[PDB]
Ligand binder design. Structure first.
Ligand SMILES: CCCCCCCC(=O)N[C@@H]1CCCCNC1=O
Ligand SMILES: CCCCCCCC(=O)N[C@@H]1CCCCNC1=O
Lengths: 250, 249
């Protein structure tokens, strides 16, 4: 440990603190992932690769780890500045590029765990997971459900998100969230708030991106940091088709 | 504005308008510095922050500060951070410790308050008492490592005094022991929470309780939601009820 991680004691012993220091994490996408990166860095994960090709837009400022001065800059450049001002000795490696079928494997290679925060409009969201399973790299899928944070982990030998994808039609986050609500309702725990926002979003006249709130981003960042700690320290986790849902209502 | 574009459906324009000016008083810029950013990005642009401490190294594992902030007043550092997120936001700071003499005037003028005050200061319980008198509900956020804990003292309800015993001093360990005992009594024991309580008590040296970034980030989300519910007059649980949020729900 260090005096920076002084208040981590009892929860983490010194050997765990050292372990997560160099534990190579791959983060694909610096949007929702920028909140996760700060929470995970402050926890003690100092070896983070961030890959994103987008620039900071105004609409990011309601839930992503950027400032007014960052607007029009590569998200990856801004989040590295933010992260390295929190920990100057941290090993924060960025790549201002979009992932494609040709480059995605070499980026994945060398990491012990990955966070798939990739827009489903790019080409590689599902292929990203397939390579990680092939390489024994578990994949965290964090989602911003407004009031809730949702994480599901694709484990190397388990079901992938394909299981809920339909053969022949495209797959996005609305499918994931509709699976979660149906699963919760199946078990007698309907999330009526979640079903309500899905209904409003689908019956929107105009075709827009899903709404997201700072609440869910902040909650999911904490969830991911806990999950990462469990994965690095070989504590048990729930794998997809099971998931973690956290909200004030719960 | 386009800054709140992705807030749609969850909030209508009139709610976004309402919380913009909803005056929040935040006592304590430690765990409160995480809460402040999440609430500002949500759309709460009228925040008063009162704290007398400086930024220390040990804050960096869970609080909203940088290596450059160390040795600076928390309120100046957190205001710089907040104003870099929103230049037009109304962030009023006071680098002062709260005392019996000043605490009422700070509370005056706010619709809701967040009590994140160290229990070694003079006014943690008096702060709530004054807020109760003035119809100001008070959020008490706690960092339970893996969990976020919030309880709201409502003006006409029980205060934290009810779990204090008149003969010994009262701190956050009493709140957490209350929460864990409540959970076990009602059939959902939090063995993780009891475990960290047990480890901390049997520590040789007397140190401050450990805290993690996860609970800070989770408690910041919970507080922002609770603020939105209070401001838009949606139902919330008041103390002796509470909200506990963790990876397992
Ligand atoms: C109808 C309302 C619920 C919509 C749920 C979207 C939440 C979310 O997280 N979506 C994406 C998915 C791509 C990678 C991660 N980041 C994102 O922003
Ligand atoms: C034994 C382990 C559990 C200890 C719980 C401490 C959590 C916490 O919140 N403590 C303080 C209390 C003062 C106001 C808010 N901020 C704080 O840091």
């Amino acid at each position: 440990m260090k005096h920076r991680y002084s208040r981590n004691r009892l929860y983490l012993n010194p050997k765990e603190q050292e372990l997560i220091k160099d534990y190579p994490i791959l983060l694909g996408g610096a949007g929702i992932g920028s909140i996760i990166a700060e929470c995970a860095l402050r926890f003690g994960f100092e070896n983070i690769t961030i890959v994103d090709g987008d620039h900071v837009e105004n609409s990011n400022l309601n839930r992503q780890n950027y400032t007014e001065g960052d607007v029009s800059v590569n998200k990856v450049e801004a989040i590295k500045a933010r992260l390295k001002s929190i920990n100057s000795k941290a090993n924060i490696k960025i790549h201002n590029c979009f992932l494609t079928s040709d480059n995605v494997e070499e980026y994945i290679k060398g990491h012990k765990v990955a966070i798939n925060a990739l827009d489903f409009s790019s080409e590689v969201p599902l292929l990203f997971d397939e390579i990680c399973q092939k390489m024994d790299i578990p994949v965290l899928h964090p989602y911003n459900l407004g009031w809730g944070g949702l994480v599901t982990i694709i484990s190397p030998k388990g079901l992938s998100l394909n299981s809920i994808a339909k053969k022949g039609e495209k797959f996005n986050e609305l499918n994931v969230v509709e699976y979660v609500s149906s699963y919760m309702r199946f078990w007698g725990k309907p999330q009526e708030w979640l079903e309500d926002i899905i209904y409003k979003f689908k019956n929107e006249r105009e075709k827009l991106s899903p709404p997201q709130l700072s609440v869910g981003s902040w909650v999911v960042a904490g969830m991911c940091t806990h999950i990462l700690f469990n994965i690095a320290t070989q504590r048990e986790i729930k794998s997809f088709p099971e998931f973690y849902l956290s909200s004030l209502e719960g």
